[PDB]
């Protein structure tokens, strides 16, 4: 209680990757002969982020050398990761052969169940109230290298004696070499971190493969003479970072200014970029023999799995004061504190420890700031209103020692308040009417609002719209989700459907479908609403998407929606969140 | 008593393997002519694992960097491992013949004694309450590699002088090379540690053997004439973490939100995969000559012995509330404490320290909070009952200096209790009924609940039944155990039995048999119930399965089976667990 | 409070990079006939510096070891660095092919996608009053080198033995061989950090490629038979810290003399050379065969991108009194400060915690010394104004403990003040008229002002001019802006603009266009105000430049324009900053 406040909480992030999702050809080289399989088994990304908020100063603080700022912290580190990121428990393979007779070309092939080709994490603010200030790592590695540079001379001499049936010979020889060689050494790992600085908004670190990262770079054969079959792939070479687990480790440090005001959307993008092996043999013939060489496959099929979240920072919540906020209680009720109304007009409530309007941050000058609007104080000149701040020395109360009693500093009179109504006023002494008894408390503003969830994919620009006062939800559908909005006149998205209207009261939960739309792109292609009563209703079709995936939000107990975020660009809708209360 | 408190206890994990399951076929080439044997002696289980709950934050901290939750710590670590795991004390080899004379195919054998091929520990939370939040070793390696890349060349020139009888010779010769090569550095180890991340509430680490992980590998000749016969394997690469010792040592904590509630099951499987090493000469005939080839069977068998244990969580356990709670003594009376029922309503009970109904926590605001209920504080408005949490003034509590007296900040009266009912009330003074001596201590509501052992295995889906009020199990029992449950149309798991029932009352132990199912795979065979009067009562059957292990549950002096917890899939069951009280 | 104060704000550096600005040649070896292509994607500077200002001791600290001095400190650190640098998110490349036939030239090229071949920082005093004192890094490296000096010989015999039809030969050989080689070990960097120290205002910092700095260092092929067609650049080289993010990290400290005044200006020029990347292959032409040899083209062309700001020091400023300053509150009044003017008469005013002039330093000898003007103090001998500095005893203050009196340590009386006027003097005891009630508290001198958007480039000679009394900017415009100045005769710059005249009063925004010049260098070319009332004006062109980039700089509601900073040459200015208040 004399340090600086925090908001801290976590975010789970857990998504479950389908069988199909997973999905390949068993074959590149004769891709639709071959058929096609899941290439990891129960595949799944659980992660937990921890985010806090704070101002970079404590309340009042002055002339320190760091930087006034509201800092915003995105962190997944030795404190909190999470399970991590798993496709698969081992890796086996599958072989296939040309159906075909075959003299020169490739006729066998491997497909090796998937790894991940990298992870990758993207951090986005939404507006730019928030600038990226600083992360970890910080940077991509500049990398050290040793060179070495070598040269040298041999000066040798032979002396020879034969002997034989012919007669004796004898040689005499000389030699000098000049020898020089250059040596380069450097590091690569499994995974390297690279680091993506797009703008001030935003950024994004991905493990991505280094060492072993093509298909040929797991091969441990060259060429083989033809009667030889056998899997030409050292599968040691693939890490269980590779599909077993991975944990990433990282901080996005967000700052926005000292005075900034509104709020502004932080979004999480994880996702694994699920890659299937292929590598081939291929018959050479030329007259004189033949053999068999191996190869890689690189440009083959990938598959990105991505699990959105995000959260919403309101850079004008208390704990941004970087003060720890106190209530003043009028002592004569069992439960009644002084309240502001938006005005600052001043009432006498019961109670509320998380109310910020009973709050009040209590400063070096002994004024009582309000945590919620600090540009108002209590001031004695005038008890039916929070006053603009200043050095009003009525604004500065002290508490008389071992009593109950507040007094102002300017005229020593204490805060009294009406036994009946609470109203409050400066007074000498008590009376039968005024009581001058005054209790004060630490109160709990810090508490972190849990966040929606997103339905659907984070790409496009991003919308946001208050939902109506008829309380619906208008849709243009048809293959997919066309466009949303809280009126018919507000759609995001594009043009294609046919319009139609949701009624958002009594909604129990909501379910949405996406993927890899038939027509184009990854789009979200249908929302199914079901209701308190049990009716359900749907608009879109789960029909013309491959590769689908659902996405479950179920409301807590009698909430209502709120606001909207819509993802779109100006053909289709590709994700939503419903924003509660 | 300034401190956050935990729940602290030890998890023994003890099992013997017998010499039955420590047996193989003497030999792979000729599996059934050459007999079988143990592969180790007196192999065994002995880990101690410990475990701490507790909440992430004191009661009543506000604004901490650290996210509000509940967490639940299982490690095996510096401070406590237990004696390890053990499989032989040295290692030694049978050889073994072709029976049949040979030309041309594999003619000898040399079987070794066995090794941990990996050591396995799984992490498993029974619900979805609870979700992995670290662990230790945070993940596997991320690998680091050294290239080298060399190149140079090389010019030389040789000055020669030949005379013989023949007649004088002389050479001038000139030379020049090229060279290039790529180096590749990297680490192994004896076992490699690696992580399974299979989801948000499982998580496993598997010491996997890596360098040396094949029986080719351990052999040190490649090649030899037919009349060598020797041992063809370098027993020096086979390392005593590999059979006499090994001791595992990880983290793994979970976290629960900060107001979950109920329960979830924490399931440990320990285990070691026991594998016999075989490998062979193979005879070669090609016309010329005839030699020797060595090497090693990979494709062998393996067996897995396996030790659970399980402990159990209530997120409603007053370790969670973070606080230290003390009980207030109405100290008129020898031994008599406040203590709160379901409902909330007090009566003034013996005083017992280990009560959790008798226990407060005294807040930041000078509240008396249950901790069996942290959502009820005792309440001076109303002395008959604890009320629900808030800023009432009459909720808040002081200490009158150097007196064993307790007054209400609201009033100022002082707490008070009837020298005969031990009533509650707020008096201004004491007088003949009424005493107004309050005494209090901190109390032990720490401590932790012993658990029940795991019969079998657990492996299929688990359920969870509570034990009817007719206080019996109901069986399908045949040659194994088909079914378990707490009535007859609550059975978990297959069909095929014959329906029975046993008594639950009055037993004094119970002992399960298990293991490899003649029919298929491993299962539960037979329970055995013994009563406190001595009659004895089996369901199930001892003579259909092999490489079987005993688990013996004596239950202490009279406690009642309440739960029942069973591993089972859709044809047998596979474990029970039996919960007291 | 009792610890050196500091002035403490971060700057951003944001830098939108156009495509245009992004674009090259598609070709070197055929310029004009194969067009041109943006060579990044979104290239983008988002940097965040992190200022400090303070004394280097303490006020009033005698006999340190640490000399008397203002202190300037610039950093990008582990605590701030902004987002980074960013110029692509992957590498591609275009092939080209000659159009004519070829039997011995340049046949084939590829032109890669560009990466930074450096990044480049510059920190620039604008006058001498700052010198440079230290940085980090503090130097360029000295590299350490390992030299090896090996040297042998060998000795050898052969013995032969040759049995033929012809008959027995027999041969007895002797070899001497002496060797002599030396190595040369060191290291280098992708990115080697060169400091250039221009002088004792001006530093700069350069992240330049070392390893793999040229197009030859990226070649992995040197030559091929003429059917190879294939990228000869292994691209795996070249660093994501090359493109995707890279964030310096310096520090720059100046220093100004303990005495200095007035005010210098500080000039951080941070910037991108983006480098394409052209490598061909040569048909080789010889009678006997023919081969394909690869290159790298070096003296292709590049383009510096760069973001300049700047911030203003008043070593004026309270901040680098190294002390605390206070107020002195006359407490009849509700809100009334002691106030001193330029010539340091003292009046009472309303209270201004920022307010400079009501700031006081209370000293080790218990002197009020002015914050804004340390050679004066509060005088008890004459309190209708400050005095100069001295021992004088009536320059020295005590407070009454436990009261709100402050006496005069010579005479013992203390301080008073007018209830109506404020007017101060000296008494023995209080009465009608007169209050010794003084109040005192810490005030907040230490914000800092913001600084203004610099238009254009920093380059040329800087020059500084006072607003007119008229309120109007000059102008000589033409094809670019050829000078400007605070009045006609004033005019920094060049001489051949028609000269024109703009209106500074009810200015809401600016916007500067600069770039290449079509006629010579790079120069602002035009500007645009835009008024209150919505009218516009411009003047320079627009259409004279390439490259072209645009400054927008919005004033903040009704501040005036007070001062001009200018950047130019003999011919024409090349950059301005419009100073506010």
Same mark, same amino acid.
């Given at each position: 209680?004399?340090?600086?406040?925090?908001?801290?909480?976590?975010?789970?992030?857990?998504?479950?990757?389908?069988?199909?999702?997973?999905?390949?050809?068993?074959?590149?080289?004769?891709?639709?002969?071959?058929?096609?399989?899941?290439?990891?088994?129960?595949?799944?990304?659980?992660?937990?982020?921890?985010?806090?908020?704070?101002?970079?100063?404590?309340?009042?603080?002055?002339?320190?050398?760091?930087?006034?700022?509201?800092?915003?912290?995105?962190?997944?580190?030795?404190?909190?990761?999470?399970?991590?990121?798993?496709?698969?428990?081992?890796?086996?393979?599958?072989?296939?052969?040309?159906?075909?007779?075959?003299?020169?070309?490739?006729?066998?092939?491997?497909?090796?169940?998937?790894?991940?080709?990298?992870?990758?994490?993207?951090?986005?603010?939404?507006?730019?109230?928030?600038?990226?200030?600083?992360?970890?790592?910080?940077?991509?590695?500049?990398?050290?290298?040793?060179?070495?540079?070598?040269?040298?001379?041999?000066?040798?001499?032979?002396?020879?004696?034969?002997?034989?049936?012919?007669?004796?010979?004898?040689?005499?020889?000389?030699?000098?070499?000049?020898?020089?060689?250059?040596?380069?050494?450097?590091?690569?790992?499994?995974?390297?971190?690279?680091?993506?600085?797009?703008?001030?908004?935003?950024?994004?670190?991905?493990?991505?493969?280094?060492?072993?990262?093509?298909?040929?770079?797991?091969?441990?054969?060259?060429?083989?003479?033809?009667?030889?079959?056998?899997?030409?792939?050292?599968?040691?070479?693939?890490?269980?970072?590779?599909?077993?687990?991975?944990?990433?480790?990282?901080?996005?440090?967000?700052?926005?200014?000292?005075?900034?005001?509104?709020?502004?959307?932080?979004?999480?993008?994880?996702?694994?970029?699920?890659?299937?092996?292929?590598?081939?043999?291929?018959?050479?013939?030329?007259?004189?023999?033949?053999?068999?060489?191996?190869?890689?496959?690189?440009?083959?099929?990938?598959?990105?799995?991505?699990?959105?979240?995000?959260?919403?920072?309101?850079?004008?919540?208390?704990?941004?004061?970087?003060?720890?906020?106190?209530?003043?209680?009028?002592?004569?009720?069992?439960?009644?504190?002084?309240?502001?109304?938006?005005?600052?007009?001043?009432?006498?409530?019961?109670?509320?420890?998380?109310?910020?309007?009973?709050?009040?941050?209590?400063?070096?000058?002994?004024?009582? !700031?309000?945590?919620? #609007?600090?540009?108002?104080?209590?001031? +004695? $000149? /005038?008890? @039916? %209103? &929070?006053?603009?701040?200043?050095?009003?020395?009525?604004?500065?109360?002290?508490?008389?020692?071992?009593?109950?009693?507040?007094?102002?500093?300017?005229?020593?009179?204490?805060?009294?308040?009406?036994?009946?109504?609470?109203?409050?006023?400066?007074?000498?002494?008590?009376?039968?009417?005024?009581?001058?008894?005054?209790?004060?408390?630490?109160?709990?503003?810090?508490?972190?609002?849990?966040?929606?969830?997103?339905?659907?994919?984070?790409?496009?620009?991003?919308?946001?719209?208050? !939902?109506?006062?008829? #309380?619906?939800?208008?849709?243009?559908? +048809? $293959? /997919?989700? @066309? %466009? &949303?909005?809280?009126?018919?006149?507000?759609?995001?998205?594009?043009?294609?459907?046919?319009?139609?209207?949701?009624?958002?009261?009594?909604?129990?939960?909501?379910?949405?479908?996406?993927?890899?739309?038939?027509?184009?792109?990854?789009?979200?292609?249908?929302?199914?609403?079901?209701?308190?009563?049990?009716?359900?209703?749907?608009?879109?079709?789960?029909?013309?998407?491959?590769?689908?995936?659902?996405?479950?939000?179920?409301?807590?107990?009698?909430?209502?929606?709120?606001?909207?975020?819509?993802?779109?660009?100006?053909?289709?809708?590709?994700?939503?969140?419903?924003?509660?209360?």
């Amino acid at each position: 209680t004399n340090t600086l406040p925090h908001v801290a909480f976590y975010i789970s992030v857990n998504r479950a990757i389908s069988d199909e999702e997973c999905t390949f050809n068993n074959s590149w080289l004769w891709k639709n002969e071959k058929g096609s399989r899941p290439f990891c088994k129960d595949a799944n990304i659980s992660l937990i982020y921890r985010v806090n908020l704070e101002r970079s100063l404590q309340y009042g603080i002055v002339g320190s050398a760091t930087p006034d700022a509201k800092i915003v912290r995105i962190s997944l580190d030795d404190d909190s990761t999470g399970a991590g990121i798993h496709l698969n428990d081992q890796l086996g393979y599958r072989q296939f052969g040309a159906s075909y007779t075959t003299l020169d070309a490739y006729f066998r092939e491997w497909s090796t169940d998937a790894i991940a080709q990298d992870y990758r994490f993207v951090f986005n603010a939404s507006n730019n109230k928030a600038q990226i200030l600083k992360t970890f790592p910080v940077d991509n590695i500049n990398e050290k290298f040793e060179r070495k540079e070598v040269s040298g001379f041999e000066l040798g001499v032979t002396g020879g004696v034969e002997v034989s049936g012919d007669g004796p010979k004898a040689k005499l020889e000389a030699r000098a070499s000049y020898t020089q060689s250059r040596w380069l050494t450097y590091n690569t790992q499994d995974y390297r971190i690279e680091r993506n600085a797009k703008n001030a908004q935003a950024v994004s670190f991905t493990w991505n493969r280094q060492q072993y990262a093509t298909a040929e770079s797991l091969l441990n054969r060259s060429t083989d003479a033809l009667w030889v079959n056998t899997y030409p792939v050292d599968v040691n070479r693939i890490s269980p970072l590779s599909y077993a687990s991975f944990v990433p480790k990282m901080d996005v440090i967000y700052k926005a200014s000292a005075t900034e005001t509104g709020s502004t959307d932080f979004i999480i993008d994880s996702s694994v970029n699920i890659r299937p092996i292929y590598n081939g043999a291929y018959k050479h013939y030329y007259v004189v023999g033949a053999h068999q060489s191996y190869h890689g496959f690189e440009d083959t099929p990938r598959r990105r799995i991505t699990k959105s979240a995000s959260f919403t920072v309101d850079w004008d919540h208390p704990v941004f004061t970087g003060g720890r906020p106190v209530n003043l209680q009028l002592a004569s009720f069992n439960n009644r504190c002084i309240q502001v109304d938006a005005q600052g007009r001043l009432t006498a409530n019961m109670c509320d420890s998380q109310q910020s309007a009973q709050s009040f941050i209590y400063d070096q000058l002994g004024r009582y !700031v309000s945590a919620s #609007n600090t540009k108002l104080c209590l001031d +004695g $000149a /005038a008890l @039916d %209103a &929070l006053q603009p701040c200043n050095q009003n020395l009525t604004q500065r109360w002290e508490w008389r020692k071992g009593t109950d009693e507040l007094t102002n500093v300017y005229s020593g009179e204490s805060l009294g308040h009406d036994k009946q109504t609470g109203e409050l006023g400066l007074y000498a002494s008590s009376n039968d009417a005024v009581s001058l008894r005054t209790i004060t408390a630490y109160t709990d503003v810090f508490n972190a609002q849990e966040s929606s969830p997103i339905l659907g994919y984070t790409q496009g620009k991003m919308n946001q719209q208050r !939902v109506g006062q008829d #309380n619906r939800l208008y849709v243009r559908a +048809g $293959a /997919a989700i @066309d %466009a &949303l909005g809280s009126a018919s006149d507000l759609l995001v998205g594009g043009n294609g459907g046919s319009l139609s209207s949701v009624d958002l009261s009594g909604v129990k939960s909501i379910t949405a479908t996406s993927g890899d739309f038939q027509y184009g792109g990854q789009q979200l292609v249908a929302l199914t609403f079901t209701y308190q009563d049990g009716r359900q209703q749907t608009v879109g079709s789960k029909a013309y998407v491959t590769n689908a995936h659902e996405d479950r939000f179920d409301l807590p107990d009698a909430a209502k929606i709120t606001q909207l975020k819509i993802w779109a660009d100006d053909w289709l809708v590709k994700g939503v969140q419903f924003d509660l209360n």
